[PDB]
Amino acid sequence: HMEFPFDVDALFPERITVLDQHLRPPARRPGTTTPARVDLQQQIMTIIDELGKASAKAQNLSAPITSASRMQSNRHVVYILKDSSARPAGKGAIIGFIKVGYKKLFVLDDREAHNEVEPLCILDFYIHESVQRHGHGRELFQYMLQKERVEPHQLAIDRPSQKLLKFLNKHYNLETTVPQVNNFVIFEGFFA
Ligand SMILES: CC(=O)SCCNC(=O)CCNC(=O)[C@H](O)C(C)(C)COP(=O)(O)OP(=O)(O)OC[C@H]1O[C@@H](n2cnc3c(N)ncnc32)[C@H](O)[C@@H]1OP(=O)(O)O
Numbered sequence: 507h508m509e510f511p512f513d514v515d516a517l518f519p520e521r522i523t524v525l526d527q528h529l530r531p532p533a534r535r536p537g538t539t540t541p542a543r544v545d546l547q548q549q550i551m552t553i554i555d556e557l558g559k560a561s562a563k564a565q566n567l568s569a570p571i572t573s574a575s576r577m578q579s580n581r582h583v584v585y586i587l588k589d590s591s592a593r594p595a596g597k598g599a600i601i602g603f604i605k606v607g608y609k610k611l612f613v614l615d616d617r618e619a620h621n622e623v624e625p626l627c628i629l630d631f632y633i634h635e636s637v638q639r640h641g642h643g644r645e646l647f648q649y650m651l652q653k654e655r656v657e658p659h660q661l662a663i664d665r666p667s668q669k670l671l672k673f674l675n676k677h678y679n680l681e682t683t684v685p686q687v688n689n690f691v692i693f694e695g696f697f698a
């Protein structure tokens with residue numbers, strides 16, 4: 507649970523909200539009423555900024571790798587998990603996010619040859635400390651896999667943490683790796 511100076515439940519009606527470089531405010535049920543979309547977009551930018559900073563602290567990074575500005579200059583896609591039916595039911599509570607995007611990589615296969623590929627990459631991924639290890643990461647990962655239409659073994663991971671390595675092994679049996687020099691991680695089956 508992390509909170510904001512505005513109504514997160516009104517802004518994000520769905521449990522998982524997908525945003526891309528357009529930072530498009532979700533459509534609300536007819537009524538309603540709604541603040542100007544430019545202002546709703548600013549709210550979204552602030553949420554992404556704060557989520558990025560929170561993930562950086564959790565990962566012991568000196569700067570965020572996720573931000574509103576970087577969302578707008580890159581072709582990233584973020585999935586944001588809110589706590590629907592949070593209590594007390596205040597103005598909403600975001601639980602975490604996952605950010606993905608296609609990146610051109612020079613990948614080493616076994617037999618150690620470099621291959622130019624552009625897989626979908628897991629770029630940032632954070633669940634609030636208070637509720638880590640409760641299954642929310644899996645919720646978010648499963649949803650992303652469905653929307654992106656990809657198989658787990660087809661992914662590359664940008665600098666996975668120890669926690670993420672265990673997570674990927676437990677949920678998707680991604681265990682054996684093919685060593686790279688570019689700080690990305692891929693698993694057996696990536697080359698199928
Ligand atoms: C490319 C990247 O983004 S790299 C960085 C990934 N993000 C981070 O490391 C930030 C801090 N960690 C988190 O935000 C989360 O723990 C995530 C995103 C890695 C996983 O989400 P969670 O909600 O915790 O995972 P979820 O509950 O769905 O699944 C649990 C499994 O994840 C792994 N895991 C989660 N926390 C831990 C932990 N403290 N120690 C070891 N493994 C852990 C385990 O495999 C765990 O299963 P287990 O309890 O049976 O051992």
Ligand SMILES: [Cl-]
Pocket residue numbers: 571572573574575576577580582605
């Ligand atoms: Cl970003």
